[PDB]
Amino acid sequence: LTTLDVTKLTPLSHEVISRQATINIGTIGHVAHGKSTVVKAISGVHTVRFKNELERNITIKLGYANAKIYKLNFKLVRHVSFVDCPGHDILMATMLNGAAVMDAALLLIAGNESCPQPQTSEHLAAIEIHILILQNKIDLVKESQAKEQYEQILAFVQGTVAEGAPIIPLKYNIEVVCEYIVKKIPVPPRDFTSEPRLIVIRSFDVNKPGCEVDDLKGGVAGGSILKGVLKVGQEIEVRPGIVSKDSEGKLMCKPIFSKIVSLFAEHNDLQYAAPGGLIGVGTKIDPTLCRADRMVGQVLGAVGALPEIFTELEISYFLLRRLLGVRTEGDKKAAKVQKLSKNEVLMVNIGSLSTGGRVSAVKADLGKIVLTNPVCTEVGEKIALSRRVEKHWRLIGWGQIRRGVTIKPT
């Protein structure tokens, strides 16, 4: 049981005021969606069950898992949120679009085989960037374990070019990994004094069917806060808002204003929200505007964020020649990113804002991407560029916004 209060001015990453989630640590490995068992053994199985709906983007949404590390009748020392999405490509694209995401990593390597999945994981770790590799190949002979350790050390010798000097080796391994994480993970510098800014990654409608007119709650949004601290009762605004084109003209976006009536983590959170976790800021928004995942892709500002609404963006890009770390046995032009074809839909991913964009024009140094929906990110931020080759979106290159079309409706 915690005793969080509403009296704080300059909190810290390791401060005990929050003690829920302050540091986000990534988890990319060759588990192939098998890391759920390790996460449950390290954090808990049923720890996250507070709002459910019909899933929409299973493989394109980043998922978190809150966990508090306790040490020495035990006292909690640190709290870290483990992030593990299906497919390392999405996490790599999201992380390498700025900063303040996945401050730590855990390479879930395997001691049984050294297939191309470890190479892809190493390439993703190098591209995204304090890593901590760990082998989950349990139930092996002592000689087999020694041979696997030797092979892992041989691989890490090459992998140490960027970051390859970790050490790790059923619950005993989990405890050892937890101790190593507590000992080695450093506190990242987060700007708590800045204005709060939240990016929505999950929307819900808590009002159950056939409810009374008294117990009618709505506007239970969600997402992650990068810079700033959100306090209950503050007047918040949605940067995207409601976008309509019924006026027989250009798309018009009207921002939505509300007040933070609640703030809920996996457990019961206090009136103040801290960066580095999945905090659901339930405002006084009508559930009709916020149904299941109908608000995803909007930035919940506080004081009218300067980022204007952008319809099209001129981005100078450096397309990567081949697939990052993907060299299959065949490689029959599959791992070869072609040039930016005109009228081609690409997944523009600015930080954690996953949106869609088609290429309108390009002359050898800069494309003019028209987005499927307006976004409010920046005027010169780094925007990644992705494209699926076979039913799987994968990173294609980088980008830098130079100009755009602004929409400023009242």
Added chain:
Amino acid sequence: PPPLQAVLVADSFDRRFFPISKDQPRVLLPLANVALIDYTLEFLTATGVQETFVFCCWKAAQIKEHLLKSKWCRPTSLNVVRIITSELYRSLGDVLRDVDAKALVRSDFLLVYGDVISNINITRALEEHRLRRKLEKNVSVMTMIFKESSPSHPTRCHEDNVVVAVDSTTNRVLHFQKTQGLRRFAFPLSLFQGSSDGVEVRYDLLDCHISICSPQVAQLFTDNFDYQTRDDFVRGLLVNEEILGNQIHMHVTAKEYGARVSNLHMYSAVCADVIRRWVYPLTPEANFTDSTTQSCTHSRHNIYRGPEVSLGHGSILEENVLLGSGTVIGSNCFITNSVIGPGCHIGDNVVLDQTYLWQGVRVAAGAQIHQSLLCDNAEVKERVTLKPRSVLTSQVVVGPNITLPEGSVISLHPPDAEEDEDDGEFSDIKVFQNEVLGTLQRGKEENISCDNLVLEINSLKYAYNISLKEVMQVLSHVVLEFPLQQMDSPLDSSRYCALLLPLLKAWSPVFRNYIKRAADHLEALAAIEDFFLEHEALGISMAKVLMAFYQLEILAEETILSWFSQRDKGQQLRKNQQLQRFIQWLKEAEE
């Protein structure tokens, strides 16, 4: 359940009707003196649809004006039609994304195109879809309607032929593909693992392009923003079955008609079917779009005659002829299997076979017209013969004494038309080295950044699990070989020094980052010795190459001394005056 809804895409996002579609939308093209939009609206109304959404982008003004004057926009129409226009539409995926954005639909709507001729009643298919949805709890997301047919029918065009593999006991679509240009069809084995009890492969299905959809369809379309066509959705959904199952089922009709007009072949086939009462009760004499102009009487051999047709003396109407109001036919004519629009004027001793004439067409005496289309107000002069598959667009005249070939398409627009028309007729580690060399060559041409270039080289090394010493040897060998490519066949040392200058300076950060350890420096020197020996013609400039490593700090001063001290045949090459002078100069300059 709520009233049945329907989304009617009134714009085909593909140009299969140039130059006809350059002044009139394909949706408004008259099939049997009635526009296609009227046919599809009648089909929607007759099957119980109570709310319709028309999404028109290309020439939306004409479609809006035509719809507002139509029967379905009257206050007495039970099928309420909503007109939504947008210039930003580019595909059916955009239309469905907009539908999901504005939340037009609530449950189990209809997706059809604006050029679908049908008389299908979907009550049984809708009931089956709803029962399946209720029993499976939101698994079946779409129910596509197919018509039993034969591969040899004129309606089965080569472009839109489709082969579908299904589960025979639940009418579930397991695989779906088009047979355009394919002489042999292939099916993955993953079909047979699940429904091993029964699997059928059907090629006798004609795609009516009618689907019973759920709001989950629009949700999936807006989730995958790159989807553009219904076929894209079907393929992407059927390949992604392990997660988000979202299965698709189907319905087959046998005694009902349905087909969409996609090109001139489909246009002619569907027009012939409509005239021959294959789409009953949607017949020319039914006047399902109630209007004074489009009233006609049916006679023997499917002859439809309008008011004041005034047939001449001796002219014979063989069969399957529709004559519009106000038409005038000369004497000794012979019209068969043809549709003639209202207000046409026809001369004497003409022959019309499987031809289509729209409003205002004027034909002079003695013409011979076979299997051709004449658009609005087209004119043909005296004694002109039109071979099959000919098209004359609006306001087009053809001069006398000319026989247009069997593919003539002429209009008033020069580029799109094949002939501009007017009042006249005439006038192991080896692959890594190649990839590194290819990336370096591409990077140099495009001026790739050092950090980006280093990452690409590192990514290739990690992908192939290359070692550290091997990478240093490979990098030096690839770079050295690349400088040799600067000169075609000079076989001189001066050219090698010229090429090694830009290569070393531009790629200095990459080499320095990769070559930092003393062991790597020793390996790099050994690789340089092999490169110099293998290029002894250009190896006379080895002194400059050795100085380049020290100048770029890739190889330290002690590394050069250690390499020179260590020796043989290579030592004799390193014992030359040029090599000795460079070592002495470097030692004195350093200190």
